[PDB]
Design a protein around this motif. Sequence first.
Motif, PDB file in Angstrom:
ATOM      1  N   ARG A 267       0.920  -1.238   0.139  1.00 62.10           N
ATOM      2  CA  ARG A 267       0.014   0.109   0.061  1.00 62.10           C
ATOM      3  C   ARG A 267       0.878   1.294  -0.029  1.00 62.10           C
ATOM      4  O   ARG A 267       1.813   1.305   0.642  1.00 62.10           O
ATOM      5  N   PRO A 268       0.652   2.236  -0.930  1.00 64.94           N
ATOM      6  CA  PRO A 268       1.432   3.469  -0.761  1.00 64.94           C
ATOM      7  C   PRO A 268       1.329   4.238   0.480  1.00 64.94           C
ATOM      8  O   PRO A 268       0.383   4.442   1.190  1.00 64.94           O
ATOM      9  N   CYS A 269       2.551   4.823   0.763  1.00 67.50           N
ATOM     10  CA  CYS A 269       2.639   5.412   2.036  1.00 67.50           C
ATOM     11  C   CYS A 269       3.809   6.717   2.246  1.00 67.50           C
ATOM     12  O   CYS A 269       4.717   6.472   1.061  1.00 67.50           O
TER      13      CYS A 269
ATOM     14  N   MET B 131      18.779   2.780  11.546  1.00 66.08           N
ATOM     15  CA  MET B 131      17.798   3.869  11.155  1.00 66.08           C
ATOM     16  C   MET B 131      16.410   3.387  11.509  1.00 66.08           C
ATOM     17  O   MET B 131      16.247   2.187  11.377  1.00 66.08           O
ATOM     18  N   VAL B 132      15.294   4.185  11.674  1.00 63.42           N
ATOM     19  CA  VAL B 132      13.886   3.771  12.148  1.00 63.42           C
ATOM     20  C   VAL B 132      13.275   4.614  11.255  1.00 63.42           C
ATOM     21  O   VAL B 132      13.407   5.617  10.967  1.00 63.42           O
ATOM     22  N   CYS B 133      12.119   3.928  10.577  1.00 69.12           N
ATOM     23  CA  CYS B 133      11.203   4.569   9.638  1.00 69.12           C
ATOM     24  C   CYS B 133       9.847   4.321  10.084  1.00 69.12           C
ATOM     25  O   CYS B 133       9.178   3.118  10.232  1.00 69.12           O
ATOM     26  N   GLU B 134       8.974   5.609  10.212  1.00 69.22           N
ATOM     27  CA  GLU B 134       7.749   5.575  10.213  1.00 69.22           C
ATOM     28  C   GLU B 134       6.902   5.811   9.104  1.00 69.22           C
ATOM     29  O   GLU B 134       7.468   6.539   8.168  1.00 69.22           O
TER      30      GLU B 134
ATOM     31  N   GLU C 142      -6.958   3.597   6.424  1.00 61.88           N
ATOM     32  CA  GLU C 142      -6.515   3.331   7.504  1.00 61.88           C
ATOM     33  C   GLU C 142      -6.027   1.918   7.385  1.00 61.88           C
ATOM     34  O   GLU C 142      -6.150   1.025   6.553  1.00 61.88           O
ATOM     35  N   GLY C 143      -5.364   1.359   8.354  1.00 63.91           N
ATOM     36  CA  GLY C 143      -4.422   0.229   8.258  1.00 63.91           C
ATOM     37  C   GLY C 143      -3.668  -0.211   9.457  1.00 63.91           C
ATOM     38  O   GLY C 143      -3.767   0.781  10.407  1.00 63.91           O
ATOM     39  N   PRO C 144      -2.977  -1.064   9.393  1.00 65.96           N
ATOM     40  CA  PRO C 144      -1.911  -1.522  10.355  1.00 65.96           C
ATOM     41  C   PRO C 144      -0.803  -0.432  10.610  1.00 65.96           C
ATOM     42  O   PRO C 144      -0.707   0.300   9.786  1.00 65.96           O
ATOM     43  N   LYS C 145      -0.527  -0.214  12.019  1.00 63.81           N
ATOM     44  CA  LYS C 145       0.794   0.928  12.003  1.00 63.81           C
ATOM     45  C   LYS C 145       1.993   0.071  11.481  1.00 63.81           C
ATOM     46  O   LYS C 145       2.543  -1.051  12.182  1.00 63.81           O
ATOM     47  N   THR C 146       2.556   0.642  10.438  1.00 60.86           N
ATOM     48  CA  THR C 146       3.820  -0.166   9.995  1.00 60.86           C
ATOM     49  C   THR C 146       5.196   0.608  10.275  1.00 60.86           C
ATOM     50  O   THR C 146       4.842   2.152   9.926  1.00 60.86           O
ATOM     51  N   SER C 147       6.240  -0.007  10.464  1.00 59.36           N
ATOM     52  CA  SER C 147       7.541   0.850  10.229  1.00 59.36           C
ATOM     53  C   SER C 147       8.460  -0.196   9.934  1.00 59.36           C
ATOM     54  O   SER C 147       8.250  -1.389   9.607  1.00 59.36           O
TER      55      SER C 147
ATOM     56  N   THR D 116      14.177  -5.087   9.855  1.00 62.88           N
ATOM     57  CA  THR D 116      13.035  -5.648  10.647  1.00 62.88           C
ATOM     58  C   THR D 116      12.007  -4.910   9.953  1.00 62.88           C
ATOM     59  O   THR D 116      12.177  -3.721   9.570  1.00 62.88           O
ATOM     60  N   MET D 117      10.898  -5.354  10.114  1.00 64.11           N
ATOM     61  CA  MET D 117       9.343  -4.646   9.470  1.00 64.11           C
ATOM     62  C   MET D 117       8.470  -5.245  10.457  1.00 64.11           C
ATOM     63  O   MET D 117       8.525  -6.325  10.789  1.00 64.11           O
ATOM     64  N   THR D 118       7.700  -4.244  11.048  1.00 65.81           N
ATOM     65  CA  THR D 118       6.658  -4.322  11.845  1.00 65.81           C
ATOM     66  C   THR D 118       5.384  -3.856  11.468  1.00 65.81           C
ATOM     67  O   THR D 118       5.077  -2.842  10.892  1.00 65.81           O
ATOM     68  N   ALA D 119       4.130  -4.756  11.592  1.00 64.16           N
ATOM     69  CA  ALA D 119       2.894  -4.309  11.395  1.00 64.16           C
ATOM     70  C   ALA D 119       2.011  -4.674  12.729  1.00 64.16           C
ATOM     71  O   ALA D 119       2.004  -5.661  13.134  1.00 64.16           O
ATOM     72  N   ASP D 120       1.656  -3.459  13.532  1.00 63.31           N
ATOM     73  CA  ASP D 120       0.951  -3.492  14.821  1.00 63.31           C
ATOM     74  C   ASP D 120       1.950  -4.549  15.803  1.00 63.31           C
ATOM     75  O   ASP D 120       3.097  -4.001  15.903  1.00 63.31           O
ATOM     76  N   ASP D 121       1.559  -5.560  16.060  1.00 59.74           N
ATOM     77  CA  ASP D 121       2.348  -6.525  17.108  1.00 59.74           C
ATOM     78  C   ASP D 121       3.204  -7.788  16.420  1.00 59.74           C
ATOM     79  O   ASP D 121       3.550  -8.401  17.159  1.00 59.74           O
TER      80      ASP D 121
END
Length: 137
Positions: free
Chosen positions: A79-81, A93-96, A103-108, A122-127
Amino acid sequence: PNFSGNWKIIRSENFEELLKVLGVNVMLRKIAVAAASKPAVEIKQEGDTFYIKTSTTVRTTEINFKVGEEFEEQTVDGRPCKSLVKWESENKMVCEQKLLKGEGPKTSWTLELTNDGELIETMTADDVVCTKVYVRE
Protein backbone atom coordinates in the motif's frame (compact mmCIF):
# COMPACT_ATOMS: atom_id res chain seq x y z
CA PRO A 1 28.67 3.32 10.05
CA ASN A 2 28.61 2.87 6.26
CA PHE A 3 25.61 0.87 4.87
CA SER A 4 26.95 0.86 1.27
CA GLY A 5 27.23 -2.51 -0.40
CA ASN A 6 25.63 -5.36 -2.43
CA TRP A 7 23.72 -7.21 0.28
CA LYS A 8 22.59 -10.89 -0.01
CA ILE A 9 19.94 -12.45 2.18
CA ILE A 10 21.04 -15.09 4.64
CA ARG A 11 18.15 -15.28 7.14
CA SER A 12 14.45 -14.47 7.20
CA GLU A 13 12.19 -15.03 10.22
CA ASN A 14 8.38 -14.56 10.41
CA PHE A 15 7.95 -13.18 6.82
CA GLU A 16 5.24 -15.53 5.50
CA GLU A 17 3.41 -15.36 8.84
CA LEU A 18 3.42 -11.55 8.89
CA LEU A 19 1.88 -11.50 5.38
CA LYS A 20 -0.68 -14.10 6.53
CA VAL A 21 -1.88 -12.04 9.52
CA LEU A 22 -2.14 -9.03 7.16
CA GLY A 23 -4.61 -11.10 5.02
CA VAL A 24 -2.32 -11.70 1.97
CA ASN A 25 -3.72 -14.66 0.10
CA VAL A 26 -1.87 -17.96 0.09
CA MET A 27 -0.85 -17.72 -3.65
CA LEU A 28 0.87 -14.32 -3.03
CA ARG A 29 2.46 -15.55 0.17
CA LYS A 30 4.00 -18.61 -1.50
CA ILE A 31 5.33 -16.41 -4.29
CA ALA A 32 6.78 -13.90 -1.74
CA VAL A 33 8.85 -16.64 0.07
CA ALA A 34 9.95 -18.61 -2.96
CA ALA A 35 13.67 -18.81 -3.91
CA ALA A 36 12.98 -16.77 -6.99
CA SER A 37 11.64 -13.77 -4.90
CA LYS A 38 14.72 -13.61 -2.70
CA PRO A 39 15.84 -9.98 -2.50
CA ALA A 40 19.32 -8.66 -3.36
CA VAL A 41 19.66 -5.20 -1.90
CA GLU A 42 22.17 -2.65 -3.33
CA ILE A 43 22.70 0.37 -1.05
CA LYS A 44 24.76 3.48 -1.81
CA GLN A 45 24.97 5.73 1.34
CA GLU A 46 26.43 9.29 1.04
CA GLY A 47 26.14 10.64 4.64
CA ASP A 48 22.40 11.01 5.28
CA THR A 49 21.47 10.38 1.61
CA PHE A 50 20.53 6.79 0.59
CA TYR A 51 19.90 5.03 -2.70
CA ILE A 52 18.58 1.50 -2.32
CA LYS A 53 17.72 -0.86 -5.16
CA THR A 54 16.07 -4.14 -4.39
CA SER A 55 16.16 -6.81 -7.14
CA THR A 56 14.69 -10.29 -7.32
CA THR A 57 14.50 -12.62 -10.39
CA VAL A 58 11.30 -10.80 -11.54
CA ARG A 59 11.25 -7.36 -10.07
CA THR A 60 13.46 -4.35 -9.38
CA THR A 61 12.63 -1.25 -7.42
CA GLU A 62 14.60 1.81 -6.44
CA ILE A 63 14.03 4.16 -3.51
CA ASN A 64 16.05 7.37 -2.83
CA PHE A 65 15.69 9.13 0.52
CA LYS A 66 17.54 11.44 2.89
CA VAL A 67 17.33 10.93 6.70
CA GLY A 68 14.91 13.51 8.05
CA GLU A 69 13.10 14.12 4.71
CA GLU A 70 9.69 12.62 3.84
CA PHE A 71 9.43 10.39 0.80
CA GLU A 72 6.88 7.94 -0.67
CA GLU A 73 7.17 4.16 -0.81
CA GLN A 74 4.90 1.08 -0.28
CA THR A 75 4.07 -0.86 2.90
CA VAL A 76 5.18 -4.55 3.20
CA ASP A 77 1.91 -5.65 1.70
CA GLY A 78 2.06 -3.02 -1.11
CA ARG A 79 0.00 0.00 0.00
CA PRO A 80 1.36 3.53 -0.88
CA CYS A 81 2.69 5.41 2.15
CA LYS A 82 4.59 8.52 3.22
CA SER A 83 7.74 7.56 5.09
CA LEU A 84 10.30 9.37 7.25
CA VAL A 85 13.55 7.88 8.48
CA LYS A 86 15.40 9.03 11.71
CA TRP A 87 18.74 7.88 13.15
CA GLU A 88 18.20 5.92 16.35
CA SER A 89 21.96 5.58 16.79
CA GLU A 90 24.98 5.89 14.56
CA ASN A 91 24.44 2.31 13.19
CA LYS A 92 20.59 2.13 13.02
CA MET A 93 17.79 3.93 11.23
CA VAL A 94 14.10 3.74 11.97
CA CYS A 95 11.26 4.53 9.58
CA GLU A 96 7.69 5.52 10.35
CA GLN A 97 5.09 5.10 7.67
CA LYS A 98 1.76 6.80 7.15
CA LEU A 99 -0.73 5.46 4.56
CA LEU A 100 -1.60 7.88 1.70
CA LYS A 101 -5.23 6.63 1.51
CA GLY A 102 -7.40 4.99 4.22
CA GLU A 103 -6.55 3.21 7.49
CA GLY A 104 -4.53 0.18 8.26
CA PRO A 105 -1.99 -1.47 10.50
CA LYS A 106 0.74 0.76 12.07
CA THR A 107 3.76 -0.12 9.99
CA SER A 108 7.43 0.69 10.32
CA TRP A 109 10.88 -0.72 9.42
CA THR A 110 14.43 -0.58 10.66
CA LEU A 111 17.91 -1.19 9.26
CA GLU A 112 21.04 -1.59 11.33
CA LEU A 113 24.63 -2.64 10.78
CA THR A 114 26.50 -5.11 13.08
CA ASN A 115 30.19 -4.64 13.84
CA ASP A 116 30.67 -7.91 12.16
CA GLY A 117 29.08 -6.41 9.00
CA GLU A 118 25.63 -8.03 8.85
CA LEU A 119 22.72 -5.76 7.84
CA ILE A 120 19.59 -6.50 9.90
CA GLU A 121 16.18 -5.41 8.65
CA THR A 122 13.07 -5.60 10.72
CA MET A 123 9.51 -4.76 9.53
CA THR A 124 6.63 -4.39 11.95
CA ALA A 125 2.82 -4.26 11.48
CA ASP A 126 1.11 -3.60 14.82
CA ASP A 127 2.30 -6.39 17.14
CA VAL A 128 4.00 -8.64 14.51
CA VAL A 129 7.62 -8.35 13.52
CA CYS A 130 9.60 -9.94 10.71
CA THR A 131 13.43 -9.92 10.67
CA LYS A 132 15.76 -10.45 7.74
CA VAL A 133 19.57 -10.50 7.79
CA TYR A 134 22.02 -9.86 4.95
CA VAL A 135 25.76 -9.93 4.34
CA ARG A 136 27.91 -8.15 1.73
CA GLU A 137 29.00 -9.79 -1.41
